[PDB]
Amino acid sequence: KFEEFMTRHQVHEKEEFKALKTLSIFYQAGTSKAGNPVFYYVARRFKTGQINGDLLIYHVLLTLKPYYAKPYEIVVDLTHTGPSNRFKTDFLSKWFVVFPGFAYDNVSAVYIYNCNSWVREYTKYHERLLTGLKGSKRLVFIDCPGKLAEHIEHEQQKLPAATLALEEDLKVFHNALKLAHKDTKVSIKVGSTAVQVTSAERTKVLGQSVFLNDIYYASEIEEICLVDENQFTLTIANQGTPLTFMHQECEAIVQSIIHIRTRWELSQPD
Amino acid sequence: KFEEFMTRHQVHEKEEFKALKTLSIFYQAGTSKAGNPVFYYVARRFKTGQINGDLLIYHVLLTLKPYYAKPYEIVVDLTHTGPSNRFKTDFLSKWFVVFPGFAYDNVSAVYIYNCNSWVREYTKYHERLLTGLKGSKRLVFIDCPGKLAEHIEHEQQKLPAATLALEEDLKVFHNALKLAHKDTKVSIKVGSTAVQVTSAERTKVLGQSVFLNDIYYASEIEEICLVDENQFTLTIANQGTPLTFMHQECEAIVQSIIHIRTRWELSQPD
Ligand SMILES: CCCCCCCCCCCCCCCCCC(=O)O[C@H](COC(=O)CCCCCCCCCCCCCCC)COP(=O)(O)OCCN
Ligand SMILES: CCCCCCCCCCCCCCCCCC(=O)O[C@H](COC(=O)CCCCCCCCCCCCCCC)COP(=O)(O)OCCN
Ligand code: NA
């Protein structure tokens, strides 16, 4: 939309805008197996309050400008995406008008990576705006890290190194159950830096059945309570409501998590 | 001084004071080989400007009162102590008068742990108020971690866990040379979370020849740079002029430091 294009050009690229590039929130990297240019959006790298929306969306416009006249694909990294990264209602709706019609058409495929519970609720709450994304063949959720290789060569992939690191050396606990108004089978994976709870059964997101992956850095873990011989709880910072899980070896799970919370506290800024 | 005993009792400890115990800057722990109650002061734990000095002194005064009538010893952990942990002149002086005479005399010995370059400079800078400490034999510097056992049995030692963490799994580079106007024989030790530059030769601190242990967390390392095959740069956050080191294995050192810096970056907040 050149009307927004020029409104953003009456004052040329400032020095805050140029900072967006260095933080690698949206960038082009690699080519897909289909022979299309790939772009990456690292959701967790956007802070609602800290980052000016108009600059971001404009930074994306300049990035896609040269490419979006032809086929191209987007990889959306939803790793550890939470409230602090959300696009507020009014800002979210901008994305549907600021780009040319063909730019939207030329998107060959969108690859959703590490979709989580919060994002699901987000799409739930913004079900209106995202109806065009509902049951779309272009929308492709990555069940597990290994399936992305089906669309993009492993070497052509360029996810944030921090994202890939979350897939290394995990103590995995299968057959766990997440207790709530609605029970759900999950796997509880403990890493040196965080804890990941992956749904063992598919769930609905934007019309598709997918696997969610909730990530909690050790820094977010406040309270760790062992309730029973097969039940424990986690208190996540700024989340309020405690998470409850059931597992045969809750004693081993808690110890494992306490350890990573400790190793973290040790190496911290005094 | 019972004026501080009075002035502090007329208002008391309602709020913030109770938080001084939660961060444990000064605490009693263990018993020395001499047969005395040991107390610890974690210098890094105190943040000048954030914590009220009078409240701190009041804390220390209370956790000492039950004991300072009899002989006791103090272990001051100067690990990673810097400017943001300093005692302002007017606050420093308050320490020499607020306590009862006998309370001072009853300090059997003070064990200084991990004294660094900055503290030494702070000492030289505040020489006027620290003149009584110059030459004092009650001041016992700890050459190396093991030497502490000469005064406190291992099972009694209660140094902060974070301190002990810096002692294990270290890749050491001996016979290195720190390049300045005055060149200093130093050993460079790379831990999983920090780099330690330990002086191989002694310098003067409060009138005593001792070794220094400069500690730089992975989070403080902004710029590593290999100059020669045997010389490299080490830029620390908020210290300006970078450190310079000579060593036959500089390539190996730089590669090791870059590693722990990269690993740290892969674990940082969004
Ligand atoms: C806010 C929380 C965190 C971010 C994610 C929020 C959404 C939930 C998770 C799923 C994200 C899927 C977004 C995919 C966008 C790229 C391609 C696409 O799906 O198609 C078009 C979008 O193509 C674009 O140009 C998007 C450019 C990417 C920049 C930023 C990436 C993610 C930002 C959040 C959602 C934006 C979706 C686009 C809205 C038009 C939309 O056209 P339409 O179906 O609505 O038909 C009529 C159009 N008026
Ligand atoms: C007496 C003052 C104690 C605090 C000194 C702070 C300045 C930092 C110096 C650099 C490292 C060495 C630590 C100092 C050891 C303290 C022991 C000492 O010498 O005092 C004796 C006994 O000290 C105590 O009983 C103090 C009890 C609590 C100690 C907690 C304070 C430790 C501060 C360490 C970090 C400060 C600065 C960090 C960064 C700038 C009594 O001798 P005096 O008769 O000369 O004193 C009064 C004369 N009328
Ligand atoms: Na004794």
Residue B241: domain span: 160-270
Give yes or no: residues A9 and A110 share one domain.
Answer: yes
Give yes or no: residues A165 and A137 share one domain.
Answer: no
Q: What is d(CA A86, CA A126) in angstroms, rounded to the nearest whole number?
A: 11
Please name the residue whose Cα sits nearest to atom 15 of ligand 2: B110
Give yes or no: residues A8 and A50 share one domain.
Answer: yes
Compute the C-alpha angle B12/B13/B19, nearest 5°: 165
Resolution in A: 2.7
- The closest alpha carbon to A13, from A68, A47, A52, A59, belongs to A59
Give yes or no: residues B210 and B224 share one domain.
Answer: yes
- Mode of pairing for the β-strands spanning B139-141 and B107-113: parallel
**Which residues 182-221 in chain B show a CB within 8 A of chain A?**
192-194, 217-219
The token pair at A4 is: 């927004």
Residues after which chain B is discontinuous, using a C–N cutoff of 2.5 Å:
none
The token pair at A247 is: 């597992």
> Residue A130 C-alpha to ligand 1 middle, in angstroms?
8
> Within chain B, where are the H helices?
2-11, 53-64, 89-94, 101-105, 117-125, 161-165, 250-265
- Mode of pairing for the β-strands spanning B243-246 and B171-178: antiparallel
* CATH number of domain containing B170: 2.30.29.30
> Residue B22 C-alpha to ligand 3 middle, in angstroms?
29
State which amino acid sits at residue B217. Y
Asked if A85's CB is within 8 angstroms of B269's CB, the reply is no
Last residue of a domain, one of A159, A180, A203: A159
Give yes or no: residues A80 and A199 share one domain.
Answer: no
Task: For chain B, state the CA radius of gyration.
Answer: 20
* CATH number of domain containing A84: 3.40.525.10
- The closest alpha carbon to A208, from A126, A135, A137, belongs to A135
Last residue of a domain, one of B128, B159, B190: B159
**CB of residue B74 inside a 6 A radius of ligand 2:** yes
CB nearest A267 (choices: B45, B193, B265): B193
Give yes or no: residues B144 and B196 share one domain.
Answer: no
A219 contacts in B (CB within 8 Å)? 269
List, in order, residues 6 or more apart from A220 with CB less than 8 Å away: A236, A237, A239
- The closest alpha carbon to B236, from B80, B125, B85, B119, belongs to B80
Q: Could you count the other beta carbons within 10 Å of the beta carbon of residue A29?
A: 15
A137 and A206 in contact (C-beta within 8 Å)? Answer: no
A41 and A137 in contact (C-beta within 8 Å)? Answer: no
- The closest alpha carbon to B89, from B120, B130, B140, belongs to B130
Give yes or no: residues B15 and B75 share one domain.
Answer: yes
Give yes or no: residues A256 and A229 share one domain.
Answer: yes
**Which residues 231-250 in chain A show a CB within 8 A of chain B?**
none
List, in order, residues 6 or more apart from B98 with CB less than 8 Å away: B1, B4, B57, B61
Q: What is d(CA A144, CA B126) in angstroms, rounded to the nearest whole number?
A: 60
How would you write B88-143 as a 3-class SS string? CHHHHHHCCCCCCHHHHHCEEEEEEECCCHHHHHHHHHCCCCCCCCCCCCCEEECC
Identify any residues that bridge with A188 across adjacent strands, giving them in sequence order: A173, A197
With the C-alpha atoms ordered B97, B99, B101, B106, is the resulting torsion angle positive or negative? negative
Q: Could you count the other beta carbons within 10 Å of the beta carbon of residue A245?
A: 21
| Site of tokens 């991990």 | B114
Last residue of a domain, one of A129, A159, A189: A159
**CB of residue A72 inside a 6 A radius of ligand 1:** no
Compute the C-alpha angle B128/B130/B134, nearest 5°: 110
**CB of residue B123 inside a 6 A radius of ligand 2:** yes
CB nearest B162 (choices: A85, A162, A266): A266
The token pair at B242 is: 């970078």
The token pair at B57 is: 């002194």
Compute the C-alpha angle A193/A199/A201, nearest 5°: 160
Q: What is d(CA A226, CA B173) in angstroms, rounded to the nearest whole number?
A: 44
What does residue A256 show for φ and ψ, rounded to 5 degrees?
A: -60, -40
- The closest alpha carbon to B86, from B118, B114, B130, B112, belongs to B118
Q: What is d(CA A161, CA A193) in angstroms, rounded to the nearest whole number?
A: 14
Identify any residues that bridge with A111 across adjacent strands, giving them in sequence order: A75, A140
- The closest alpha carbon to A57, from A15, A116, A4, A114, belongs to A4
- The closest alpha carbon to A33, from A152, A154, A156, belongs to A152
What determination technique applies here?
Answer: X-ray
Distance from CA of A80 to the nearest CA of B (A): 8
Give yes or no: residues B150 and B24 share one domain.
Answer: yes
Percentages helix, strand, coil for chain B (3-state, rounded to 5) are 30, 30, 40
| Site of tokens 């108004």 | A181
Percentages helix, strand, coil for chain A (3-state, rounded to 5) are 30, 30, 40
A11 and A45 in contact (C-beta within 8 Å)? Answer: no
List, in order, residues 6 or more apart from A268 with CB less than 8 Å away: B162
Distance from CA of B163 to the nearest CA of A (A): 8
How far, rounded to the nearest angstrom, does the alpha carbon of residue B257 sit from its chain's CA centroid?
22
Asked if A162's CB is within 8 angstroms of B267's CB, the reply is yes
Q: Which of B24, B62, B76, B130 to mutate to test the pocket of ligand 2 (most atoms within 8 A of CB)?
A: B76
Distance from CA of A83 to the nearest CA of B (A): 12
Q: Helices B53-64 & B2-11, crossing angle to 10 degrees?
A: 110
Give yes or no: residues B134 and B232 share one domain.
Answer: no
The token pair at B234 is: 């080490």
Shortest CA distance from A266: residue in chain B: B162
Give yes or no: residues A22 and A116 share one domain.
Answer: yes
Q: What is d(CA A147, CA A111) in angstroms, rounded to the nearest whole number?
A: 11
Q: How many domains does chain B have?
A: 2
**CB of residue B140 inside a 6 A radius of ligand 2:** no
A188 and A247 in contact (C-beta within 8 Å)? Answer: yes
Q: What is d(CA B160, CA A262) in angstroms, rounded to the nearest whole number?
A: 13
Identify any residues that bridge with A28 across adjacent strands, giving them in sequence order: A39
- The closest alpha carbon to B13, from B58, B57, B49, belongs to B58
Q: What is d(CA B42, CA B215) in angstroms, rounded to the nearest whole number?
A: 15
- The closest alpha carbon to B40, from B14, B79, B69, B10, belongs to B79
What does residue A92 show for φ and ψ, rounded to 5 degrees?
A: -60, -40
Give yes or no: residues B179 and B239 share one domain.
Answer: yes
Task: For chain A, state the CA radius of gyration.
Answer: 20
